Amino acid sequence: VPKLPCRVDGACDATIIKMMTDLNKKGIKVASVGQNYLISIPASALFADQSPRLNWASYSLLNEIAAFLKQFRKIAITVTSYSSKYVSVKRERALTLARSRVVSEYLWSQGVDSRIIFTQGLGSDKPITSYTLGGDRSPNARVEITFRRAV
């Protein structure tokens, strides 16, 4: 015991499950199927009205995301951005690209213990709900972060 670590450093399964429950009841979607994990966040609670900029209060949420991401031993990370149809295709794709870039940059700045990070956006080309009444409040406008836990 005083010669080898009994567990991954700073890892607590009780903490993991508790924060998972807290995030899910907060409203950010979290799914763990098999050895692959996916997390979804609505656009409005993170960005401005179709604007590549960050609301200040969202930094606490980003900190919580980083705290959750610290625990797992991860190799590759993927972040994708999606939005609604506003002006064109190019404009929306550029907006998603910028959002992915900024979120990836901040995550890498934070202590993410991964080796590879991929970032991309796809505008409004992959709708997930027929109900598109609202604008940025629509669920389809979102950001996804996915990976597979290894060993």
């Binding site: 080898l4 670590p5 009994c6 567990r7 991954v8 450093d9 890892a11 607590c12 399964d13 009780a14 499950i17 508790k18 763990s32 625990q71 836990r149 060993v151």
Partner: protein, 78 residues
Amino acid sequence: DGCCSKMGGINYCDSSAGRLVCNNGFYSTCYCTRHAVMDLQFLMGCCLWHGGVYPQLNSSGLVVCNDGYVSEECSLQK
């Protein structure tokens, strides 16, 4: 203490993965055996990155690694 705390509870260990399995189908953070993927960045011992401590006995404080280099740091010096 409780590897599967706030979970279903400890079932057994997969030796091939070298990891324990809780009742809920999630790998616990703990370990089973040395034959598992740890992360090692610091370690003890002297005459490292060399032939190791030469098994011969030197009456003086000098200790020499098997490659022939002498490490005063492992040795004791007046």
